[PDB]
Write a protein that binds this ligand. Structure first.
Ligand SMILES: Nc1nc2c(ncn2[C@@H]2O[C@H](COP(=O)(O)OP(=O)(O)OP(=O)(O)O)[C@@H](O)[C@H]2O)c(=O)[nH]1
Ligand SMILES: Nc1ncnc2c1ncn2[C@@H]1O[C@H](COP(=O)(O)OP(=O)(O)CP(=O)(O)O)[C@@H](O)[C@H]1O
Ligand SMILES: Nc1nc2c(ncn2[C@@H]2O[C@H](COP(=O)(O)OP(=O)(O)O)[C@@H](O)[C@H]2O)c(=O)[nH]1
Ligand SMILES: [Ca+2]
Ligand SMILES: [Ca+2]
Ligand SMILES: [Ca+2]
Ligand SMILES: [Mg+2]
Ligand SMILES: [Mg+2]
Ligand SMILES: [Mg+2]
Lengths: 54, 438, 352, 425
């Protein structure tokens, strides 16, 4: 039951009590993922329009 | 002094953000018009409260915050609300149609078209900072914007601000206050993509906040206002160290150093006491031992789970009010001899304690009563993995039938991203089990 | 209309409870994966406690206490007794035991040999028994070399405890036996002891000069019915109930079952369950637990009672299924989900 | 500003559409001349969803009236709220459609469809942010059925990313105008399967049985049936017309109600349904029991014959939201066998403070139930009884259609039935 690193100031204080010791994707890759999804949306809408054209 | 920028995404993030900045102002003595009589340095200064507030030459203290929502109705409340004067228009970003509770719609379809604008508005706030620490991101799991756009924003923040820390305050989906059936999908999609970009995340289960409001506050049917004022009290307790003089959790980095020894396991359980009804005749003020002992009751945890059947990796005790170190140690000793507290063998068995002498501030006319002392415990327990289990189970129930998957694929997302995100969660649950169980 | 699910088809006990529940006409069984349930008769292993108590407007109850395995595991029970101050290492009602991990994997090998070497030098009885939870696999020997070598040939944790060389023998027959007590703990952590126990007796004369033939040394109902040639001779199914046993104690030893044995059994039950109450209690939890336990005791010729083990998923004597299972519905289920005596249990009061 | 564009086509479509605008106009305080005379700000909060604001503070419904004969729309214009509609939004021909799907879809309808789309485009161009469209029509006639589904196909072509919503009256031999109604309905259902996101299935037999047995109306009329549709349309659109959080717009409703794209046909329900004991107060338990009772549903399908994929309930009036949750959870927790267990929490509940005219409180039911296959099985059986003899086909082949197109609609609807069957198990 030890207390360490006691720090005190006008607005409070803090300390540590020890009970027992122990025993990314680049900006380029993000645009590609965003554009790949936009492309799949365009492809799906194109097939919808193609279906409606028939 | 090092600045912190708060980012509020989606309805949950915006509305919770509104409640916090209202509280922040009452705590720092800032008026709705931004004036701060106690700030003797007019138009500048590097005090602790400046980490969250900039200052204009006219003496206005402006939050370092950005609000983002793909639909204008929630953010218009901020534009015409009590604290409309705090913010300027550049800080509030709103689209015209939301993500329809569709992660893929917020991340891809709509996110791609607004991401650069939000980054520009954030860059403006960063340019006022002489030493930016990082970001605090408020959002929900279940919303299409809070889930789908947030993960996009976090990816770009890591690219634009590589060396900056990022903390999360995330709203875990609860059916009692939810009306979107696909929220398990969104929660798991956004956790998968955000996991490597968040240094520390404080999950709040709406179920827990809901029951605390009905049980302790005697609210039969709590509203978002009720839920948000309670949430902002907890948020305030966590961010106080950044806004006040002190030596514990004085910058965002210390949050990871003190609470997250293993990076993926960065979801500390929050526990808060006491929560007393303002409508009460008059309550017996609890001692340091009683509120400390309350930190180990499942009833006041921000996520219902049983820490008795996990292992602790870290534990912070954040006190506010009339608390002296002698009483904390005495209460702590008493709790060890009675409570089940098992630490992982590769971590010390101890507690970091921070005390702020100013007691919790309560919103006038709110639901919470003024108390002489309060505490918020932040503990990294493997027991919070119960939350992932619940969520991953619901995910599996719908995904087995591919129910609702067409809504996501129709927005340009690939079905394989579902299983990819699920396998990441499966590994996350396995990490917890390796650290907690024998 | 209360709802319940069945996730353990092999439980003879809760197969009856489920049968009784439906007979009331006020309980409805759902598919085992339906989450909208009031009561879960859960599986034995890996029961998902973490998914309980998150259904808005459903008081959920389960028939297993999370964390009770610490009491119902061979090695766990030993560790619990030696490390818990409420039980202490000097616990007078539990045989000297040690946890031994096979050398192909803390471990109490040297601590056991020390106590073993002490007995060997002091001319005292030095007969130990080796067993584990992964058994149907038991060895009884007086040489520490045989016990340790037997565990190394296995691959799971084992326990070595003192073998009771002076057991109380029933007459006629000169035969060993053990006592099974059924204990039910409800959601409020009331400890109820079923008034009806059973003595699982050995139909073979006890022979202290031959631990190789384990038929007269192990009182397991399955062993007596497979390897014993006098099964069912003295009593039906090698099961003597309390009424007969009590009459025996009076005719032979001039005492009663309550005074000579039951007081110790009740004391041991309390001590074990109260020890782990803070760790497993569901008093302030979002869901509720109850559990039926099967305590196994030994009685020596000094009429001292020793604890053998605790079973978390016990079966019941064929004659007592109806009464006990009905009792489980009355005190454990209907107490939380009431319907529209002379209790068969004995409440062991205690300080929570 | 999430605008919805309304379209009503044919006799049934315009008569039900007219009553619909009559009901909600009263709820929002709009008088027959478009002037607001309400006393609550909740009435105008979401008024622009269905109404355009003109000069002098006038509110003009965002509705387009379509028909191939003038008759019905003349009655609307001379009806109660007839003057409230934009005169330019009346698009009509003179030939008629003779209850013939081919005339509405391929010949007579094709000649008028472009002018209708010119009005739709006009209304959409003035929308700040158009949600989507809602169409009121029957499937047993010629205009609403044949030309209605033609308009949907051409609207989806020009607004492919907007939600398409319909209220579709399904024919019944008990309330039948002609014997060809199963032909026209089978042809329309395939169009709806493909080009609508949400379809409220309204069976004229259910409306009749409710009027006869429950409401005790000796001789039901079309007007009596349209009263039920009015109240029901007002109930299912409350979420869109007043401040709320759940199913607040069309796309969010679809995302919570349609787990599979083709299975988007809903069973609506309403409560109370009282006969003239009409002044008695109705408790929340009663509201919930009736709302889920089959007799209160307008699809003419027994819910206990299938399973609910998703459910959306709306409670209107000043009532205990706590007590609403309790009774809803009671219905699910007492009949969880009729809800699929692979969609957790698929029953959502929304409340609203403004009740319908003349009622302290009401409840509207929107169920996506696999039992709806019974409705499509009835139509399919009636279709086949005639198609196997090619009876009455000459009305259609005379308009350029081939038998192959009938065989395909037949197979398309049997597919739909089989799709509902695989999820019912
Ligand atoms: N605690 C709390 N939770 C909220 C609040 N608002 C919404 N939620 C929760 O957030 C989830 C829904 O996500 P939202 O934030 O509303 O959706 P969104 O981020 O705006 O994204 P969209 O789909 O575009 O609307 C549900 O689980 C709600 O219970 C709030 O103000 N406070
Ligand atoms: N220390 C000891 N001294 C004497 N006999 C012992 C003993 N430990 C075990 N036994 C004998 O072994 C039998 C049961 O052993 P144990 O209970 O460990 O195995 P088990 O768990 O498979 C049977 P059950 O679970 O049904 O009680 C008892 O009948 C008892 O007679
Ligand atoms: N509920 C209701 N159904 C109607 C009404 N008028 C016609 N119908 C039904 O609609 C079908 C006839 O279609 P109708 O609208 O008259 O043909 P259309 O004008 O060419 O579209 C039949 O099944 C009728 O039962 C009405 O006012 N109310
Ligand atoms: Ca200053
Ligand atoms: Ca990073
Ligand atoms: Ca012509
Ligand atoms: Mg939103
Ligand atoms: Mg055993
Ligand atoms: Mg007609």
């Amino acid at each position: 039951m030890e207390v360490i690193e006691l720090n005190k100031c006008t607005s409070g204080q803090s300390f540590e009590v020890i009970l027992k010791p122990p025993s990314d994707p680049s900006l380029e890759e993000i645009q590609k993922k965003l554009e790949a999804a936009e492309e799949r949306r365009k492809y799906q809408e194109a097939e919808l329009l193609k279906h409606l054209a028939e | 002094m090092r600045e912190c920028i708060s980012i509020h995404v989606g309805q949950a993030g915006v509305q919770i953000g509104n409640a916090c900045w209202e509280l922040y102002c009452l705590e720092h003595g800032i008026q709705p018009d931004g004036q701060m009589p106690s700030d003797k340095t007019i138009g500048g200064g590097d005090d602790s409260f400046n980490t969250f507030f900039s200052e204009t030459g006219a003496g206005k203290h402006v939050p370092r915050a950005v609000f983002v929502d793909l639909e204008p109705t929630v953010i218009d409340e901020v534009r015409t609300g009590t604290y409309r004067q705090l913010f300027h228009p550049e800080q509030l970003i709103t689209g015209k149609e939301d993500a329809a509770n569709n992660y893929a719609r917020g991340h891809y379809t709509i996110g791609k078209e607004i991401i650069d604008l939000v980054l520009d508005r954030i860059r403006k706030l960063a340019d006022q900072c002489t030493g930016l620490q990082g970001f605090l991101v408020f959002h929900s799991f279940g919303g299409g914007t809070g889930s789908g756009f947030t993960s996009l924003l976090m990816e770009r923040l890591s690219v634009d601000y590589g060396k900056k820390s990022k903390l999360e305050f995330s709203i875990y989906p609860a059916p009692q206050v939810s009306t979107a059936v696909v929220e398990p999908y969104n929660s798991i999609l956004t956790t998968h993509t955000t996991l490597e970009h968040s240094d520390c995340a404080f999950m709040v289960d709406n179920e827990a906040i809901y029951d605390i409001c009905r049980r302790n506050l005697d609210i039969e049917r709590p509203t978002y206002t009720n839920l948000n004022r309670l949430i902002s009290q907890i948020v305030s307790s966590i961010t106080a160290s950044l806004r006040f003089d002190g030596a514990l959790n004085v910058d965002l980095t210390e949050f990871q150093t003190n609470l997250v020894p293993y990076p993926r396991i960065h979801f500390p359980l929050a526990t808060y006491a006491p929560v007393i009804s303002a409508e009460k005749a008059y309550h017996e003020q609890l001692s340091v031992a009683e509120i400390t002992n309350a930190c180990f009751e499942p009833a006041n945890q921000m996520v219902k789970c049983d820490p008795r059947h996990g292992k602790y990796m870290a534990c912070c005790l954040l006190y506010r009010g009339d608390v002296v170190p002698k009483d904390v140690n005495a209460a702590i000793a008493t709790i060890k001899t009675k409570r089940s507290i098992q630490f992982v063998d590769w971590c010390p068995t101890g507690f970091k304690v921070g005390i702020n002498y100013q007691p919790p501030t309560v919103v006038p006319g709110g639901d919470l009563a003024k108390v002489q002392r309060a505490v918020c415990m932040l503990s990294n327990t493997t027991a919070i993995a119960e939350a992932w289990a619940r969520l991953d189970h619901k995910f599996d129930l719908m995904y087995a039938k591919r129910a609702f998957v067409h809504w996501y694929v129709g927005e340009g997302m690939e079905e394989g991203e579902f299983s990819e995100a699920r396998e990441d969660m499966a590994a996350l649950e396995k990490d917890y089990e390796e650290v907690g169980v024998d | 209309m209360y709802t319940f699910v069945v996730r353990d088809e092999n439980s003879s006990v809760y197969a009856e409870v489920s049968r009784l529940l439906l007979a009331t006409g006020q309980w409805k069984r759902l598919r085992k994966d339906n989450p909208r349930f009031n009561l879960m008769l859960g599986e034995r292993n890996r029961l998902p406690f973490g998914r309980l108590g998150h259904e808005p407007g459903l008081v959920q109850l389960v028939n297993y206490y999370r964390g009770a395995d610490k009491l119902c595991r061979k090695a766990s029970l030993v560790k619990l007794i030696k490390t818990s101050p409420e039980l202490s290492e000097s616990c007078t009602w539990f045989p000297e035991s040690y946890v031994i991990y096979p050398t192909n994997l803390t471990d109490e090998r040297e601590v056991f040999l020390a106590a073993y070497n002490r007995r060997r030098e002091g001319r005292e009885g030095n007969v130990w028994i080796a067993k584990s939870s992964a058994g149907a696999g038991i060895l009884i020997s007086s040489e520490a070399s045989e016990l340790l070598d037997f565990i190394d040939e296995q691959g799971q944790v084992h326990v070595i405890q003192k073998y009771l060389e002076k057991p109380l023998l029933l007459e006629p027959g000169h035969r060993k036996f053990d006592i099974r007590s059924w204990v039910l703990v409800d959601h409020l952590y009331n400890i109820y002891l079923y008034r009806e126990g059973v003595l699982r007796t050995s139909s073979e004369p006890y022979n202290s000069a031959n631990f190789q033939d384990k038929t007269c040394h192990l009182t397991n109902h399955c062993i007596q019915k497979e390897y014993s040639k006098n099964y069912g001779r003295y009593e039906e199914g090698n099961e003597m109930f309390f009424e007969e046993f009590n009459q025996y104690l009076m005719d032979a030893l001039n005492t009663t079952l309550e005074n000579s044995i039951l007081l110790q059994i009740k004391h041991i039950i309390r001590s074990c369950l109260m020890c782990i109450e803070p760790a497993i209690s569901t008093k302030h939890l979002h869901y509720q637990s109850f559990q039926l336990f099967g305590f196994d005791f030994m009685v020596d010729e000094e009429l001292k009672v020793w604890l053998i083990e605790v079973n978390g998923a016990p079966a019941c004597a064929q004659k007592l299924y109806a009464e006990l299972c009905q009792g489980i519905v009355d005190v454990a289920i209907s107490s939380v989900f009431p319907l529209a005596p002379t209790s068969i249990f004995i409440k062991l009061h205690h300080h929570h | 500003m999430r605008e919805i564009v309304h379209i009503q086509a044919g006799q049934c479509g315009n008569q039900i559409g007219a009553k619909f605008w009559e009901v909600i106009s009263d709820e929002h305080g709009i008088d027959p001349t478009g002037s607001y005379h309400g006393d609550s700000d909740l009435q105008l909060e979401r008024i622009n969803v269905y109404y355009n604001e003109a000069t002098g503070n006038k509110y003009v419904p965002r509705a387009i009236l379509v028909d191939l004969e003038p008759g019905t729309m003349d009655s609307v214009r001379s009806g109660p709220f007839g003057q409230i509609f934009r005169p330019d939004n009346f698009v009509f021909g003179q030939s008629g459609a003779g209850n013939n799907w081919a005339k509405g879809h391929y010949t007579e309808g094709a000649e008028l469809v472009d002018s209708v789309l010119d009005v739709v485009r006009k209304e959409s161009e003035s929308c700040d942010c158009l949600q989507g469209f809602q169409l009121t029509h029957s499937l047993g006639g010629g205009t609403g059925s044949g030309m209605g589904t033609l308009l949907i196909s051409k609207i989806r072509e020009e607004y492919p990313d907007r939600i398409m919503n319909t209220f579709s009256v399904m024919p019944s031999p008990k309330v039948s105008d002609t014997v060809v109604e199963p032909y026209n309905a089978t042809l329309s259902v395939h169009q709806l399967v493909e080009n609508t996101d949400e379809t409220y299935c309204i069976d004229n037999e259910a409306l009749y049985d409710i009027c006869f047995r429950t409401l005790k109306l000796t001789t039901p009329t079309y007007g009596d049936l349209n009263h039920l549709v009015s109240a029901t349309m007002s109930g299912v659109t409350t979420c869109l017309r007043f401040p709320g959080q759940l199913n607040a717009d069309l796309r969010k409703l679809a995302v919570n109600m349609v787990p599979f794209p083709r299975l988007h046909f809903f069973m609506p329900g309403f409560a109370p349904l009282t006969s003239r004991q009409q002044y008695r107060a109705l408790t929340v338990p009663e509201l919930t029991q009736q709302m889920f009772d089959s007799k209160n549903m307008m699809a003419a399908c027994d819910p206990r014959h299938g399973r609910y994929l998703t459910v959306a309930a709306i409670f209107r009036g000043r009532m205990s939201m706590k007590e609403v949750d309790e009774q809803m959870l009671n219905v699910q927790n007492k009949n969880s066998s009729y809800f699929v267990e692979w969609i957790p929490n698929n029953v959502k509940t929304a409340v609203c403070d403004i009740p319908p005219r003349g009622l302290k409180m009401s409840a509207t039911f929107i169920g996506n139930s696999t039992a709806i296959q019974e409705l499509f099985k009835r139509i399919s059986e009636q279709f086949t009884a005639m198609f196997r003899r090619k009876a009455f086909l000459h009305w259609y082949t005379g308009e350029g259609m081939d038998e192959m197109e009938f065989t395909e609609a037949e197979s398309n609807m049997n597919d739909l039935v089989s799709e509902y069957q695989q999820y019912q198990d």
